[PDB]
Amino acid sequence: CANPACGRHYS
């Protein structure tokens, strides 16, 4: 993804 705050996926 281009933007820094994308989503909750990898911990």
Side-chain angles (χ1 to χ4, degrees):
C1 63
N3 292 94
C6 302
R8 188 179 180 180
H9 189 260
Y10 182 73
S11 185

Coordinates of all heavy atoms in Angstrom, one line a residue:
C1 N 0.8 -1.2 0.0 CA 0.0 0.0 0.0 C 0.9 1.3 0.0 O 1.9 1.3 0.6 CB -1.0 0.0 1.2 SG -0.1 0.0 2.8
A2 N 0.3 2.3 -0.7 CA 1.0 3.7 -0.7 C 1.0 4.5 0.6 O 2.1 5.0 1.0 CB 0.4 4.5 -1.9
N3 N -0.2 4.7 1.2 CA -0.3 5.4 2.5 C 0.3 4.6 3.7 O 0.2 3.4 3.8 CB -1.7 5.9 2.7 CG -2.3 6.9 1.8 OD1 -2.9 6.6 0.8 ND2 -2.1 8.2 2.0
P4 N 0.9 5.3 4.8 CA 1.5 4.6 6.0 C 0.5 3.8 6.9 O 0.8 2.7 7.3 CB 2.3 5.7 6.7 CG 1.6 7.0 6.3 CD 1.1 6.7 4.9
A5 N -0.7 4.4 7.3 CA -1.7 3.7 8.1 C -2.7 3.0 7.2 O -3.8 3.5 6.9 CB -2.4 4.8 9.0
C6 N -2.4 1.7 6.8 CA -3.2 0.9 5.9 C -4.3 0.1 6.6 O -5.5 0.4 6.4 CB -2.3 0.0 5.0 SG -1.2 1.1 4.1
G7 N -4.0 -0.9 7.5 CA -5.0 -1.7 8.2 C -4.3 -2.7 9.2 O -3.1 -2.8 9.4
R8 N -5.2 -3.4 9.9 CA -4.8 -4.4 10.9 C -4.7 -5.8 10.2 O -5.7 -6.4 9.9 CB -5.8 -4.4 12.1 CG -5.4 -5.2 13.3 CD -6.5 -5.2 14.5 NE -6.1 -6.0 15.6 CZ -6.8 -6.1 16.8 NH1 -7.9 -5.5 17.0 NH2 -6.3 -6.9 17.7
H9 N -3.5 -6.3 10.0 CA -3.2 -7.6 9.3 C -2.0 -8.3 10.1 O -2.3 -9.3 10.8 CB -2.9 -7.3 7.8 CG -2.8 -8.6 7.0 ND1 -1.6 -9.1 6.6 CD2 -3.9 -9.3 6.5 CE1 -2.1 -10.2 5.9 NE2 -3.4 -10.4 5.8
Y10 N -0.8 -7.9 10.0 CA 0.4 -8.5 10.7 C 0.6 -7.9 12.1 O 0.7 -6.7 12.2 CB 1.6 -8.4 9.7 CG 2.9 -9.0 10.3 CD1 3.1 -10.4 10.2 CD2 3.9 -8.2 10.8 CE1 4.2 -11.0 10.8 CE2 5.1 -8.9 11.4 CZ 5.2 -10.2 11.4 OH 6.3 -10.8 11.9
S11 N 0.8 -8.8 13.1 CA 1.2 -8.4 14.4 C 2.8 -8.6 14.5 O 3.3 -9.8 14.4 CB 0.5 -9.3 15.5 OG 0.8 -8.9 16.8

